[PDB]
Amino acid sequence: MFMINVLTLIIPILLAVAFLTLVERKVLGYMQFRKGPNVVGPYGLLQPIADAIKLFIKEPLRPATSSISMFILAPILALTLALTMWIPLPMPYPLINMNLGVLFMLAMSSLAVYSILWSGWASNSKYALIGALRAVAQTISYEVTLAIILLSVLLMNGSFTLSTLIITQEQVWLIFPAWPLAMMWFISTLAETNRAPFDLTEGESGFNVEYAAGPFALFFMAEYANIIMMNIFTTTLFLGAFHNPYMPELYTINFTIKSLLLSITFLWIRASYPRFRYDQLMHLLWKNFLPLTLALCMWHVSLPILLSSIPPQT
């Protein structure tokens, strides 16, 4: 019965990642004054199915890897960590209702850089390894502002419990007291997922260009699971919805609409901006977001004390 709950979590994750690709191609079509896919299915609804069947019977590139074992373990780790970030998500009830769900998510997203690192070293190209090291350095850079923005917000929560974050936002959204944290958080989640304007794995060859089309589709679907997940986590964190404990589907519809609009905001940002040069997003992290994030971390430490609004522990 619990395994039914695990499958009703993880199989709709795979379906929503399948159709996020279609939604991205359609929304980027209409924002680029064209259509998206509308031939393959009715309104293109069979485009992800056709494309998945195409990729799973495409020939393997059959490369020379330094490690066979890390070449197998990098997609396994990417998919496993992409699926374990969902299990504490309170929507309105988490699958695993853990007391440190925020810190668990922060740790399991910190572990996601080994997929990039192991897949880069598993490729024998030195250029793929250099691009992998640039992607890892970008990601661990933006993890700093993830951790500190998240800490500064949870100073208003009182605990690392994700389910308490619904109770925190019953009177107001937490984007009202923490909109600078919210906007730096949103750009930091944009830079965690190698998402445009921070997609330097498509700027002129990434880390996973040496895989077959099947494992490349697995990396791709882990990345889009991370995108949908970080939008849901941002929605829980700043745009927390109303919850009737006798009608949980009201909260589910509300956070689902907000998370869809936030994922479409990711799609709409990649359809609007040029890329950063690599040192420019290093400049954006280390010289712009991190001083503001430390200043607001001091502010959200000292502000519940000066207003007498320290939240409860329990």
Partner: protein, 43 residues
């Protein structure tokens, strides 16, 4: 003779300059709105 020609008075005027219409609030008003949202959230 019949030939592709402009009409009797010629064509009407054609816009060719920049038109970036200067929308949005001032900097004072935008910082005031953001600080007011901060104060509402803190309260």
């Amino acid at each position: 003779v019949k030939q592709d020609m402009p009409p009797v008075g010629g064509y009407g005027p054609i816009d060719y300059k920049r038109n970036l219409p200067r929308r949005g609030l001032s900097g004072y008003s935008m910082f005031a709105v953001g600080i007011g949202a901060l104060l509402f959230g803190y309260w």
